[PDB]
Amino acid sequence: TNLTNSNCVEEYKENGKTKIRIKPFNALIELYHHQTPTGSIKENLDKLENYVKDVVKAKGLAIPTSGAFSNTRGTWFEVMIAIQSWNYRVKRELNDYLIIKMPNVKTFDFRKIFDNETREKLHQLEKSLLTHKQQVRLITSNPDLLIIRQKDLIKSEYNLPINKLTHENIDVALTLFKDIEGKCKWDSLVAGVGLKTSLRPDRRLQLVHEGNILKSLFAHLKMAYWNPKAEFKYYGASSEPVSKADDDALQTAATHTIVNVNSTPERAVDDIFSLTSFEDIDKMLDQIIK
Template sequence: MPPIVEFSEKGKPQIKRVDTFCSLLNYELPSEDSSFSGLLEQFDKIIKDKHPQVTSGALSNCHGDWYEWMLAANAWNYRIKNNKNLILLLLPNVSSFDVAALYNDELYGYINDLLLKVKKTADVQLITSNPDFVIIDTTNIKLDGEFQKSISGFTPDSIDKLEKSYQHFIGKCSFENISGYLSVKTTFRPDRRLQLSHEGSLMKATYVHLQTRDWVINPKGLKYYGAATKISDADRRGLRTVATHSILDVQATPQAAVDEVFTINSNSNCDDAFKIILNE
């Protein structure tokens, strides 16, 4: 097994996320009967046994990536197996990538123009985090052969592929190509519920702005989903928030900021969710 941690100059242990994750799964995909939360608990125990100095906070910081990789691999293989045109792709965080850059130059220009005018007029900004995944309709976008190769196991190369495939679509998406987003958390806390609602509301408001600027009649709409390993009734109630822009037009029907929330804690849960998320 490769080293689990490396140490900073100050002697602080840092978990090697990719190598450790791949090794703990024996470079395979999770088995059909595995629960994702159970795997994370198992990983924590192995790491703590070998390196007691690793903090719970450091482990929690890894959980998000590890959970996203398991969902991303399932989504990748589900699309290929079922010959879907919709693809679910991981996105980096907002500090390293502007999700609006997936749109073509004209649409990206509309969004940047909006941001500039908001800043210039009221000295405020549209601030949000990136959703964890984007849903892209690839019908009119040419894909290379890598997009038809299944993920057979977890290796540094396969994780790199899952994390960077969004780059193929930068500047190529028309208004109709981006169908929605998915944000995931291992578990929901009240502040995380607010993050999803804010993200969903702002993404949908931006979509309506593009619809107006591009004169799109009867658009199919933008979906925004959430997922976690477990979801309580309080989580579902907390996420039943209206998309703010949709209550400003008396002739429009109010929209939900978050369209649906899925419990995804296994491979079979993935299939159930993707039947909805990747349904054209």
């Protein structure tokens, strides 16, 4: 029952004071180093949170703020999803798919996945958009999850499953994006997913912005390569129940598709998934892919 030797929380100094820092990956390793998480997702998140709370208590330290936990829970959910997605393509034996948890736009802009030709197409768009009196851009956060269909990206090292959470295992899932840098043909990118532990009426609209901007960059590519068949879909996924009001908001259109009376309107977010269990991650990936 000894919790005082845990490293899921770290001490550091700032302005002559000792401060507390949650180490979200350490919490995952210290709970899941023999087996990867199973059952209800939300409960595992609360379990991890109550674990760090017990640790700080046992060490006699100040409880981390709600913001620290907001941040921390976001990472847990993403890593749970990234690991489950890694194992999905192994057990399904998807020789030509990758599901990749992306870092932030500054560490690695998702545009860097694309081959030289496609990056130049996007550079032409970006540069022309700035060639006006009123300069415009197309900025969004990196998608949390990207689904890429390209057979020659898959190496045999990806075909070893993750049965336990180590520093080494979490590292490989979270640096997967590095292997595909400058290698994806434009239509290899088939889907992205936004991952949220919970939704708010304000925060759910960030999923619409994301889908809208991504589908707008993709529609440019479809015209630059005059391909009417290639599709890019954008999805949402919550760990909580999704309400009617959440559902309506996320039916919102990618606005460039609704200008004309005889256009068929596209949703910016094609579907929203309520991931109750780890089995639901597999279910979600089944729908997105097949």
